Each structure stands twice: as structure tokens, then as C-alpha cells.
Amino acid sequence: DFEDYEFD
Amino acid sequence: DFEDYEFD
Amino acid sequence: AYHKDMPLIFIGGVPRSGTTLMRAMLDAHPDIRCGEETRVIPRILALKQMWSRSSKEKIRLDEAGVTDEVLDSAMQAFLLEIIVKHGEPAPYLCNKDPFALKSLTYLSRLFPNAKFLLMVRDGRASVHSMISRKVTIAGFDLNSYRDCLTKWNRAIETMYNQCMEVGYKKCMLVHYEQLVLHPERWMRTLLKFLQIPWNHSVLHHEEMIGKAGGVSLSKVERSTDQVIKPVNVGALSKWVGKIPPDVLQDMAVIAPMLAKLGYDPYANPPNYG
């Protein structure tokens, strides 16, 4: 469920 | 954009 | 002085279950401070829970050196800053954020001398309260008694199971209806559980609103205008007649936690007395 990174 | 509480 | 081994009190439950009353009755005690809902505590607990529940993510964190030990230390540090610094000092610090008890067992790990008070109220009452007053909860559809009872059921099942997991030396279930019908009985039992001396002021919390060593209220919390009143029986069964008959029909199936917690799902209302 988590990606390599998150851009919010 | 926040509710009183969050369930999760 | 503060540290992760200090004796903390965490109050919670599903919103609209007498959690503000409970914390206000404790705030009326000269040696306890709870204060207002922090809001941020359940949010950071939820974030953490999502990390540690993904097997893939836990592996990535472990390989980064962000182990349970590291995370737990960081969480202890964050949570203590919030609990300690957001309110007045007292010998016994307390936190009330209803959904913090979705992480009850985890908190009991982080804070080994913490005790927990799980407020339990008839789900029909809690649901009618949130719907009628429009108290918003992410994940609850206030247009549906059925959805709200379903979600109430899931939420209290998690919190109840964790209360039972840590056991009677760490968690006490407090039934809202019992508390308002018998507050001396229940407050004496509860203060014995917490190992804090009796004080009669907990039965007259209305007299301690806005006073030093007393009850600090937020003007934007949804329960403030109720908690300024003395401990009363006016909210026992406002729900009766307000729930759609199709939801009444299916009550035991929608909300099996009612029967588990001693509330008759066919009684409109149960004789709480």
C-alpha cells in the first residue's frame, strides 16, 4: 500500500 | 476540511 | 517531571459516549488534569498504526533503521510533549481523545504505568447524538442510522477488545448510563482503580468550570454546552423513537456489540437502572 515516496 | 473526529 | 514511566490516564471510546463528561469529572479533582481534546494524538497514532500494519512497509522501515524501538521512542516523545505542554501541570496527567483508544494496547506498551478508561454508551444513543447534532466523524455517514451503527459497532469492538487484552489492572470499562445514574458509586470505584484519593468535587464538576485546578473547556468542542451542566440523566434515551424502523428491525445484526456490552438490542430503551 505505500509508494516509494509521497508528494502531497 | 477536518471533521470533528476521524475513524481510520 | 515527565517521562514515559509516569502514571498517565487515557480516556476514550466512540465519540458521543460521555467522554467529555468523564474527563470533566476527573478535571474537577484537584490532583488531576485532563484538559481539552488534543486532536493531533489520534492522528499520529493512526499514521503509526498504518506503517506497522503493512508487512512491506515494516520491512522498508526496518532496513532504514526505523525499527519499532526507534518509532516507539519518537512516539513517546511526541505524545508526552503534547499531553504535558497543552494544559496545566498536575500530579496526575490525563488525555481524552475518543479514538486514541483505537491504539489502547500500543499506548499501554509505550506507557507501562498508564491506565485506561473506556467509556461505553448505548450505540443507539451515541448514533442519535452524532446524527442529531451533526458531529462529524470521518468514515461515518450522518445521513444513515444504519451506517453509523455499523461503524459504531466496528469501532467499539476494536476498543473493547483492546481493553480486555490489557486486562482489569490497566483498563476499566465505564458505562455512561451507570455513571450518570450512580456517580458516587462509579467515581469511587474509578478513583480506587486509578489509585488516587477520593474527592467529592468530582460529583459537582459544574462548580469547577473555568476554575484553577478545574475544568478547562474549548469553545469549539461539540460537548462543551452539555458538560457545563451538572451530571444529569437527560441524555439516557433521547434516541427512543428517532431511529428508522428498518434499523430497529435489524439492530442485533447491525450492532452485535450492543448485546455484548449489556444493552438489549430489542429494548426501546433498556432499563439502564
Add this chain to the structure above:
Amino acid sequence: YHKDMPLIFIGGVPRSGTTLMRAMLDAHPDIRCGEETRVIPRILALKQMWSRSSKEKIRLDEAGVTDEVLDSAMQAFLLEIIVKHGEPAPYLCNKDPFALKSLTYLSRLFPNAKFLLMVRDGRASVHSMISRKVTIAGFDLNSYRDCLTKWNRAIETMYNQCMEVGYKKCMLVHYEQLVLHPERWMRTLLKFLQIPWNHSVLHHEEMIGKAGGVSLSKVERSTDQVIKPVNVGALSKWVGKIPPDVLQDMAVIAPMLAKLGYDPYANPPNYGKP
């Protein structure tokens, strides 16, 4: 450890030489960065949301959860992660690319923190994430157009904050310039950090897995590149890969290219031309 300790934060858009940067610093005997924490940018993002809402800030203030309280909690959480997730060293460092979306905030929490913003040609960063399938929430990896638009947004925010805090607190490091002139840039960078030179930063590959050296995560996406010596093989792999509509619209899609010294109509720029 305390909130006045010297700290180094590295970031930028992913696929911009951030892992190389932190590895070159990790090769210094007195600096430890370590692996990406993953959790730091998440807690920063949460905290920012509470600040992007007047209604919520009012609720928090009326609960006693003021900026002073939140800042103390944030400092405590962040220091525990930074300090405890890796080996001790005189100069601690954190690299999580998007932590620098909260650059100005971190600078306020940590007055002795300095920042290194990695900048790489957005066309190179985008081709890297798409070709390697490095996932970023909010980026559509089936669209060069979307990824360049989101790259542009992300680096604009981070760049503006870097400049806002100023040259004594944040240094822009161009990836292409670093790999083309490693000693030149490492000398400048270590002087900016006020850390004495160590030659080991120029042979970081020799410090992989060594005490006081470079610890690499087997599940990080840049690991198999950073095991190699500093090299110029990744400057222009993007050339010819971008669809022609996106090439035509490049200056409009990604105005930060020109602002950061990259000619949006050169395929590629001659990065080393003085």
C-alpha cells in the same frame, strides 16, 4: 542531542541525485546521514495540513495545542528518528527527498540546521522515475506530461523555501555539476556546512558498508547506482525518450527548468559548458 545541535537536511524531487549526495557525505568519517526514514516527510505533511486550515488551527489553539506545543512535539519526534535510526556521529544528517517541502518550517525548529537542495534536469528526473517505475503519490508514471508538471510544482516549492531561508542556511546543488566537478562542489559544500574537508567524499564507493561509512538499504531504489563511483553516465539518458507534444510544450509545462539554468529547448543542454 538537542534542538540546537548542527543538523544537515538533504532533499529534492526524487531521482535528482539525493542518494548520491547523502552517500558522499556518509563517506566523511564525522558525518552520518543513513537511509531514508520515510516517516519524517509523512509527519511533516500531517503537521502542514493542520497549518493549512484556519478552522483547525483555531480548534488546536483552543485546546492548548499551540504552535509552541506542536513545535516542541515535532522537534522531539524528529530528533528521536534522526538520532536513533543510525550510528552516532559529530554531524548528523537526514535525507528524505520531500522533507524539504517543509524546509522553512524545519529551519525554524532547528536554527542550527542547514539544507542541501538537490536540483537535476527535470527531464532527467522524470525519465528516471518513469523508466525505473519509482512510484510517487500524486505522479502519473504513464504520462511524461503529468510527471513534468508535478516535478515543476514540487521543485518550485522547495526552491522558493531554500531561497527564503537564504544562502547561509540552504545551498542549491546541481546534480550535473556535482558529477562533472566533484571536488569543486564538495569543497564548496563542506565549507557551507562548516565541516572540515575529507578526501573520502570523492571515493564514497570505498566506504560502502564500513564503520563510519555508507549504510545502504536493499529496498531503496537508488542503491545499485550509488554503489558505483561518481560518474557521468546518467546526464542525458532522457534524450529522445519524451513524446514530441511534451517537448513542444516543455517551457510551459516546466518553467522551473529555465529558472534553474536548464534550457528547455536543448536536447540536451551541454551541462558542462562554462
